[PDB]
């Protein structure tokens, strides 16, 4: 419109209306010129690429991308607490994106005639990098100004070399809207139907579903021998009931497992060797091994043991200001998934036992351990929990088949997720950057809780009494911090 006319206002708030929530977040960003306006091919060969597992080939692009994919973007710690204490489930409905108050600079003075190239890929023709849990997300704290991350992608390879089936994508070859300092951009995206995230912890366990007061009418084999001695064989059958629960016939069994190695938090308990990569469970694809992380959703540890965690089984966030390499465990924040302990196997334990032979007069009954177990009819399981720091959605890879598309790092899997938003400054050149404002608005449908539980629930609350810094607030230096990772599961349901 004009140099002196504003193209938008500052909208941040959250509206709680009936069965829905509407969250709105506005941030201030800065976009540098990347790659000196060039496409630059990248490979492991540039950085030296010593190993086969790490061998990659791809391209780096001058463009940036907006990433709002994490929850702390859209929810204040109070709104998160409001949401998790009162509700059994939630899910995104609508999306409203806006880009306004653009300012392009030259290197520093205002260059009023420049444009900004922005577009969204709504047909999903470009590689989708927003589901890999990268950085560049809008700051948790509204005051903070952030830098837009550089866009880039990978394609097929053999080692460092490319192949014929590889692809190349020109982000200039797309249609895009070119905005000046007076133009603004907006669009609205409607989420596809997805299940409500289950923000609750079961009040029953999968093996306790029985009535403790009654006997079953099914019988089991109690005794195979009358006593000690020769030729003592017998068949004795008893009733399954309150006195022996383990043997009762059950309608449902816990979910699948792929076992993890358990590392103790007390370092002296751990073996004196390097097992971080050698001992880690992994999956190989086309000859390259890859760590299984976080893996299938499984309880982090057995009850009563809080010091053990799966080797790559749970998400691990950083504390504010944590270094990149070889930080101590008190720097990282490891999440315990133990709320799914009711329906899911422990990640570090065998699923169960199976008979390995045919018993006979000579042969004893012999059983092995089941380290990994796939889906069986009659399994019921819980998905991994979502966190205030965690991802929201992921893109379902386009494929002939999949099972339970929910992404393994948590969140809402989508065939057509919120689209990518690409931005760069229009181009020897003038050294030039830009800044502006962004507002994202998501509608959230809520599932109310009608539990008839008599006693009070467990809630998320701030425990401390007197402390130097209130949690989830700035310090003396003005640095915002998130003290702990907060789960979504407090309220309970019957299994």
């Amino acid at each position, epitope marked *: 419109d004009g140099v002196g006319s504003s193209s938008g206002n500052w909208h941040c708030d959250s509206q709680w209306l009936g069965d829905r929530v509407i969250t709105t977040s506005t941030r201030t960003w800065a976009l540098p010129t990347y790659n000196n306006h060039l496409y630059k091919q990248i490979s492991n060969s540039t950085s030296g690429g010593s190993s086969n597992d790490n061998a990659y080939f791809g391209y780096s692009t001058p463009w940036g991308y907006f990433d709002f994919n994490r929850f702390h973007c859209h929810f204040s710690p109070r709104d998160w607490q409001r949401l998790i204490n009162n509700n059994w489930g939630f899910r995104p409905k609508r999306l409203n994106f806006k880009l306004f108050n653009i300012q392009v600079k030259e290197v520093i003075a205002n260059n009023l005639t420049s444009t900004v190239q922005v577009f969204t890929d709504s047909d999903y023709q470009l590689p989708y990098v927003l589901g890999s849990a990268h950085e560049g997300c809008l700051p948790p704290f509204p005051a903070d100004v952030f830098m837009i991350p550089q866009y880039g992608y990978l394609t097929l390879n053999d080692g460092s070399q490319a192949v014929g089936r590889s692809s190349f994508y020109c982000l200039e070859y797309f249609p895009s809207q070119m905005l000046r300092t007076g133009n603004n951009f907006q669009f609205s995206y409607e989420f596809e139907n997805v299940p409500f995230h289950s923000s609750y912890a079961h009040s029953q366990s999968l093996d306790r579903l029985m009535n403790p007061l009654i006997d079953q009418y099914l019988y089991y084999l109690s005794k195979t021998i009358n006593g000690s001695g020769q030729n003592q064989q017998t068949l004795k059958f008893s009733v399954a009931g309150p006195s022996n629960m383990a043997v009762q016939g059950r309608n449902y069994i816990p979910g699948p497992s792929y076992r993890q190695q358990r590392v103790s938090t007390t370092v002296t308990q751990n073996n004196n060797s390097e097992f971080a990569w050698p001992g880690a469970s992994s999956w190989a694809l086309n000859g390259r091994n890859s760590l299984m992380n976080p893996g299938p959703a499984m309880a982090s540890h057995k009850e*009563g043991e809080d010091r053990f965690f799966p080797l790559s089984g749970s998400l691990i966030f950083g504390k504010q200001g944590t270094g990149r390499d070889n930080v101590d465990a008190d720097k990282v924040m490891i999440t315990n998934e133990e709320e799914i302990k009711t329906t899911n196997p422990v990640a570090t334990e065998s699923y169960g036992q199976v008979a390995t032979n045919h018993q006979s007069a000579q042969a004893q009954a012999q059983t092995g351990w089941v380290q990994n177990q796939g889906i069986l009819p009659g399994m019921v399981w819980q998905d991994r929990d979502v966190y205030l720091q965690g991802p929201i959605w992921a893109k379902i890879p386009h494929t002939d088949g999949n099972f339970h598309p929910s992404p393994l790092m948590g969140g809402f899997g989508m065939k057509h997720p919120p689209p990518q938003i690409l931005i760069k400054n229009t181009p020897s050149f003038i050294t030039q950057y830009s800044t502006g404002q962004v507002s994202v608005e998501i509608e959230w449908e809520l599932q109310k809780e009608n539990s008839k539980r008599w006693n009070p629930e467990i809630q998320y609350t701030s425990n401390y*009494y007197k402390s*130097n810094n209130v949690e989830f607030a700035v310090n003396t230096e003005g640095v915002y911090s998130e003290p702990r990772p907060i789960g979504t599961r407090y309220l309970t349901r019957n299994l």
Partner: antibody
């Protein structure tokens, strides 16, 4: 489980200062009172200090009072027992004990009952 | 300040046969007394609280009794695991007080 790691260690010169820490894990930190019990070489074990779960009430032993100071950090789930102007008889191995009684803020009650879960302890030589 | 005095200072006994230790408090402290045991090189362990109540991990062969001034710690079926210095504690009022102890 319930786990208490105290290390202040130390060998200090009389009149010097020392700060014991006890890192508590596995229980609700705020709802239990934490205390320090002391045992000299070849002697009986002697109560030193205790602190309320909310840290509103700190109780010191008569010999200790005015010198040692007990406090708890809610961020690190750690209880501190800083001691200054130490004396010869302060030589002993100090223990960190969780209280049996669970409390909350909505009732005025004594915060000490019995020491349910102890800790291996550290040595203070002076 | 309240004083706990534990009457046997040291003791030795045959295994399996009953042993009893008592301590007498300086005032009526009702049911506040507690009992502990400490083996050499090991941290103490809580046995009895609120005069007679036994801790979840303590064997049923331990028991305790009394109110006001007098309290007794009775051990039936003494065992080799049971030989350690024993203490009684007041929970009644601060500053808290441990008895002198009894080496068994």
């Amino acid at each position: 489980e319930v786990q208490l790691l105290e290390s202040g260690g130390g060998l200090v010169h009389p009149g010097g200062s020392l700060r014991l820490s006890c890192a508590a894990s596995g229980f609700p930190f705020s709802n239990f009172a934490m205390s320090w019990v002391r045992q000299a070489p070849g002697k009986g074990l002697e109560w030193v200090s205790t602190i309320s779960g909310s840290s509103g009430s700190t109780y010191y032993a008569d010999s200790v009072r005015g010198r040692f100071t007990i406090s708890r950090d809610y961020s690190k789930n750690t209880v501190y027992l800083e001691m200054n102007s130490l004396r010869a008889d302060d030589t002993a191995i100090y223990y960190c004990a969780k209280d049996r009684m669970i409390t909350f803020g909505e009732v005025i009650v004594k915060h000490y009952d019995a020491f349910e879960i102890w800790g291996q302890g550290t040595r203070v030589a002076v | 300040d309240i004083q706990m005095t534990q009457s046997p200072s040291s003791l030795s006994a045959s295994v399996g046969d009953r042993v009893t230790i008592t301590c007498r408090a300086s005032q009526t402290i009702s049911t506040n007394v507690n009992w502990y045991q400490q083996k050499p090189g090991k941290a103490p362990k809580l046995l009895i609280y609120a005069a007679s109540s036994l801790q979840s991990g303590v064997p049923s062969r331990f028991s305790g009794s009394g109110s006001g001034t007098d309290f007794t710690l009775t051990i039936s079926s003494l065992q080799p695991e049971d030989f350690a210095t024993f203490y009684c504690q007041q929970s009644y009022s601060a500053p808290l007080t441990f008895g002198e102890g009894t080496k068994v």
